Amino acid sequence: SRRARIERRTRESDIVIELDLDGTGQVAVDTGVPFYDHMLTALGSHASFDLTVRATGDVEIEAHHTIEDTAIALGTALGQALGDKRGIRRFGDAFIPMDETLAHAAVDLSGRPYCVHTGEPDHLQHTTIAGSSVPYHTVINRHVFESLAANARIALHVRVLYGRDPHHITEAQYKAVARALRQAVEPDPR
Amino acid sequence: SRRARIERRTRESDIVIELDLDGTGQVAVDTGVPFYDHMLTALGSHASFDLTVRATGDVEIEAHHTIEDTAIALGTALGQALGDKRGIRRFGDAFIPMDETLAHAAVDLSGRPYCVHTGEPDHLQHTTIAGSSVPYHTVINRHVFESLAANARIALHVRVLYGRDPHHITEAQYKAVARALRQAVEPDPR
Amino acid sequence: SRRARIERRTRESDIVIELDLDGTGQVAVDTGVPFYDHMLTALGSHASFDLTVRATGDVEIEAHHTIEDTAIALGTALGQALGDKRGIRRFGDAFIPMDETLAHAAVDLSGRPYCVHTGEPDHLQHTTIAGSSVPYHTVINRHVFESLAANARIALHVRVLYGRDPHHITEAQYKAVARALRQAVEPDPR
Amino acid sequence: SRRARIERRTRESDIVIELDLDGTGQVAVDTGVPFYDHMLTALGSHASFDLTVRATGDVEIEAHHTIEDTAIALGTALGQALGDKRGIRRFGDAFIPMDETLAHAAVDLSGRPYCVHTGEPDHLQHTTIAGSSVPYHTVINRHVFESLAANARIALHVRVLYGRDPHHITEAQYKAVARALRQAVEPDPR
Amino acid sequence: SRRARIERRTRESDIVIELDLDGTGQVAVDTGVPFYDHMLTALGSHASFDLTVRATGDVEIEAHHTIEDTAIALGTALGQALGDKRGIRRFGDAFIPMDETLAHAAVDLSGRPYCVHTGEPDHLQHTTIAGSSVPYHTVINRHVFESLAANARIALHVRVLYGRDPHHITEAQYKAVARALRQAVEPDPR
Amino acid sequence: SRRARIERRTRESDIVIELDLDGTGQVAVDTGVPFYDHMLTALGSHASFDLTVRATGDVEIEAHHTIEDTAIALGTALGQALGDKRGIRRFGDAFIPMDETLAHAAVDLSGRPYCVHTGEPDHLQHTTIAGSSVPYHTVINRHVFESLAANARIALHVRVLYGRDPHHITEAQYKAVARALRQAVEPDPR
């Protein structure tokens, strides 16, 4: 009913997205950027979507292009899946406490495309989250949220009230977006 | 069931209000102040009220008296329609993203009459919103929210987290009040 | 007994004033500037004068000249009506709370012509109060009080202790002047 | 002629108020909070009311609820006793010097419900006035004046110009309200 | 179904807690500290729990130990009653306007034990709330929220956005925790 | 009825005071300090007293001792003339605009002896008012008001809100005291 399959082939990367807005958290994400995978998994799960993200890109350069194309593709999927947006709550918001971190997100699904991202500590503009694979530069958080809002055609305001740990700050934000989205997309019985 | 008709005749103006708390957004507002109409329409609609506002006043002086009498009358209607306030959610809140603006409202419907309005940029104390008709001075926003809370006998806290455009700042606030109200008035199944 | 009729014909405007100091608030003001009318009505009423103000002027330029000629004419009327000022209270003062606003006025009716106006928020130097007619620039408040004091030959000190709304700030001041005047003009039984 | 009997039964407390606006200072106050009693006695006396306040409440918690219910009940009594407010002075104000303290109050009895409380030294936000009985936290001063104004439907502005002693600061304020009220409620011979 | 009985015997105090998460606000609290009772009653009621708290302690020293043991015991009860936390909303938040005060709370019920308490005015670090019985030092607010979160094994973030009255600041916080908790514990139909 | 004759013989000076509180402004002052005479004349006149002040002192030193003994003697006269202070207004206040100056005074006639003098520009601490005779050092203003309050056993608060001219600042203050006194001493019909 509220589904979308988006394929996005660029010079930089290759994306397939399958999205059901009315899902049960059946989520599989594989972008070649394992922390991004973890964030998008949290996103799909906490928004109660069913979501498959499969992506390959110029990860030898860094994660930027792949992260960005995926977020654009995902936004496009969200917009198409929403259709005419009839009889939905439209507005949604969620607070996410994650240890010392508090993040928040608010959405207007029928509002014109817009993103404002505030409150994220300055050290995230140059922080790297790195494991045994391709690393994730947290400076991209903003870029992800902007690409989502611009391609879904929605108003998306994301806040960090406070926080210290970059993994917590980042995850709380993604989870915040997820549950704001979840509340917004739900049918309104009025 | 939860309805009220209020007539308010002053020297300055003439108000009729018809209010159903359990409506479907059937809203008709005509106060002779077209931006106020637009705000009260957004209010009635987003609160899921059925609302008729019909008002005429000394608009040759300016909109103040008409805007104020209407808000008093509307508050009085809200209070009467609420009755004894039995088995309702009582507390409500809503975030409204509107482009660059984020506004918020929280209500306690059984709390004593009180209004606090914070965060609105300073230039709204002397901003005019003007078309081909009677203009709207945004300095009145505060006055409207105070008159509502005082005459409905409710706690109403309205915040602007940030914003630039006076139409957006103002509308987000009215919409914020509306959805905070909507959540609060709903029956609680507990 | 304490009456005066003043006619004032200038190039800019045309004023007729009828003033009874010992009135009952029978007040009719028509200057072509509806907010000024509202202020002068509050003035006449709250001072317990009987007052007729009829004025036409170069309102296509703006209200300044008409507002100013009227205030001069009204001051002249006040002075003439007062006569030799024998056996009157002479001193008067009044506090006017108007919602968030507190204004105050003090007068010495036998003191030499003098006006001091303090405490009015800065944004009133460029605020406009506008309806469906000729607008009122609040920067003129000072000018009105000065013209009154200078032409009535009285000491008039007008204060705003605090306030936010320009309509409230302005009206409280006019009402403050009115009741200060009322107390001052009353016969002293000593 | 201008009387009211108000009974107020809440979960927190039990209030009976008998009020004659045109009294001779026949005042009896018993709320279980002896400093509050002393303040309300000063209020009734200095306003030249005849006043009986009898109150019992959850004073084991602290005085807040009892103090608040009493002030609400008293405000309601003031409003009802005032009736249509015909031919009264309407405006009133009073300065109260009390040793090193100067306090002031101004009222508009026909003005919409509003309270502004300014100038009280910061240490009163956490000062306790304590004897052999239930103590009085001066932070409640504001709360009392707000409850009065809101339930009497009057404009009430209360100022401390300066002061040091918390008993003096508090008492001067209550006395200030009292005499402002007294002047306002008096018949106007005009 | 979601119940717990906790007995806690320390050298300092003696606590029995009975908790039903799926209650109707049947709440009875008796700790020998009447303001604490009032706060815990508001907590149980506004969270829609059924709650019995019975506590005796070394109240001759002061309320600290009793307040702390009770909060630990209550946290332990909350954790046990929650069980495996299957199919619940998990996240919850609530704004509480209480006159001039605005407080907020957000919870993650499956998040690791953590508490952050911000925004409470400085004077609450040394404010006493006192009646005819054992007094309540508001500096303990933090301590209560920390003990709750640590023993329930939950993330609990409590904010005061602003406020003046210590009774209002404190109560709004407890009520905020209550409704955040209520939303979080509710079954999720997804 | 309310009269007093006070004789005060010190080493420094010689004072006779005759005071009728219920006078018509029949005032004769001769202290050998002509500006003091002018101030005390304004005082007696504006308070509607009948007052005779006759004083000689060590004016070769300067006016201080004579000014001070006279003010003490006058205070003593005021206190004795007031008697038991039965059925009087008790509280009084007056604003005095004098050109650019605004001064104010408030009194409590039954309050314990106290004086607070604020707002007087700093240059009055070393300003001299001089003619063809014995000069007047304005630093004495404070001293006069203190001696009055201490010897009349009254609360007397004197303010300068603003002012420039030392003759105006000083005279407005004396006149302010006078009319505050006048209002206070008047019979209260309640």
Ligand SMILES: [Mn+2]
């Ligand atoms: Mn990019």
Ligand SMILES: [Mn+2]
């Ligand atoms: Mn993680």
Ligand SMILES: [Mn+2]
């Ligand atoms: Mn208004």
Ligand SMILES: [Mn+2]
């Ligand atoms: Mn917030």
Ligand SMILES: [Mn+2]
């Ligand atoms: Mn719009």
Ligand SMILES: [Mn+2]
């Ligand atoms: Mn001019």
Ligand SMILES: [Mn+2]
């Ligand atoms: Mn003042």
Ligand SMILES: [Mn+2]
């Ligand atoms: Mn008006």
Ligand SMILES: [Mn+2]
């Ligand atoms: Mn309260």
Ligand SMILES: [Mn+2]
């Ligand atoms: Mn006392």
Ligand SMILES: [Mn+2]
């Ligand atoms: Mn401890």
Ligand SMILES: [Mn+2]
């Ligand atoms: Mn309480």
Ligand SMILES: [Mn+2]
């Ligand atoms: Mn000396």
Ligand SMILES: [Mn+2]
């Ligand atoms: Mn002079």
